């Protein structure tokens, strides 16, 4: 160790030291003065910023690969270590101040944690191959797949903790990981594959079966095509034209008409999501505004949905099956956040995934021609299937559910692990994690069109069965109305870090988590706060008082 004061500029610059991975190169080790708050970020304390890369190499596609990291260690340190999760197919290196999600302004660094981030083992500015669908092109390299699946977060966690020990002269007392989406998958993977890396984990909207997302995507694309109107430049139906924003709002209003009050309170929120799934069928549901059937009896009017539309969304929500009827992913919850109107602005946060923007002459859904479909083809199918960007939608339209779904379990050539092997995080063996004191908070918006909230619930049910008493270390918070990680007519904003630290360090399990709406105009109000309830509980109004105030609600079993 350098004979210099700990936690100082001197100790920072001396990191540019033996690393757990001999192939670690530090490119930056710089002292940063305290930064004031901005409109979008809390103030950052004085700190050491360390950035570099691990395992620089050349892939079998001829491209350069490395695991980049950025670490920030505050001079005034609370003894805790924090890693933030990724997003999408990763490939970018964030500012690494420790995002906590939930629409929060504060970062973990602003709360005096040491914080770290990674790009997951590839770089969107370098591994952008125009012959292999752009920034998903890292899928052409077998090791870059393993790095994306698990290896990068492992290497960066070890490197960050080694830097922390050198800079401060002691290890962190407790370590925390927070991620949403791909980041939620990472958090579940860590609890399963690397249980001693983190003591507290928050996994939001976790893509723990991400290789199956493109299977759902082909299925929702083919389900919706009969309701499409018009064609894109490649002659493929415009899936975005299958439902206007007004059409989706009608569907959302019919869901509310059937389902809103099944929790006891008409408030634009379906808290009793299980009762909703048992009750709602758009082929038989009424439009509550006039009592007529939601499904048109004759020609299409602005107050009804065509039979073709109703068949299409019903099929899409049912989930993919093979020709023998076996489910290949899961079903999706009917929920009011499939739409929403705030002022004159329709919610886009559900429809962007399977349909895309209505006002476009091209397909732009994530699952039709977008990043999710591209990622399935190049990253999760084995062997990879690179192709022109203009062929992706056609490939989804021609997807064969007896043949193509098998490719996420296959190996081939140098791809010696399947994508479900390296990217899936489906194990419920959390004994090692639980026994060392680990705590996990899962959350998921009911109107998430990327990953099914009901599939997260099914994982949690399997966890509870495998490990009796699981609510002692792992709880799931479902959020009615919320879309993918944020947005929608629900209480989508919350501070998950504060209850996580309370659970890990004071044993105080979260019996509720306070939340508020980022867009309370969806309900025509200035603010709405509600408790998030641990599965299977839901929020129950006490029977009087302002329905927009959390104090008038409690968590309870459904009616
Ligand atoms: Ca309600």
Residue numbers in the entry: 40 to 55, 61 to 428, 429A, 430 to 603
Would you copy out the relevant sentences from the publication that reported this structure?
PETase cleaves BHET to MHET and EG, and the soluble MHET product is further hydrolyzed by MHETase to produce TPA and EG. Overall, the structure of MHETase is most similar to that of FAEs. The structural conservation between the hydrolase domains of MHETase and PETase is striking, and despite the large insertion of ∼240 residues representing the lid domain, residues Ser225, Asp492, and His528 effectively reconstitute the catalytic triad.
Of note, they pointed out the importance of Phe415 for substrate binding via an “induced fit” mechanism and highlighted Arg411 with respect to hydrogen bonding of the MHET carboxylate group, both of which are proposed to be drivers of substrate specificity. The only other amino acid with side-chain positioning correlated with ligand binding is Gln410. When Phe415 is in the open position, the side chain of Gln410 pivots toward the active site to a position wherein the heavy atoms would be as close as 1.8 Å to those of Phe415 if it were in the closed conformation. Given the observed dual occupancy for Phe415 positioning in the crystal structures, we simulated in triplicate (each simulation 150 ns in length) the four combinations of Phe415 position (open and closed) and active site occupancy (empty active site and MHET-bound). One of the MHETase disulfides is located at the active site, connecting cysteines (Cys224 and Cys529) adjacent to the catalytic residues (Ser225 and His528, respectively), which is conserved in tannase family members. A similar Ca2+ binding site was characterized for Aspergillus oryzae FaeB (AoFaeB), wherein it was hypothesized to have a role in stabilizing the lid domain.
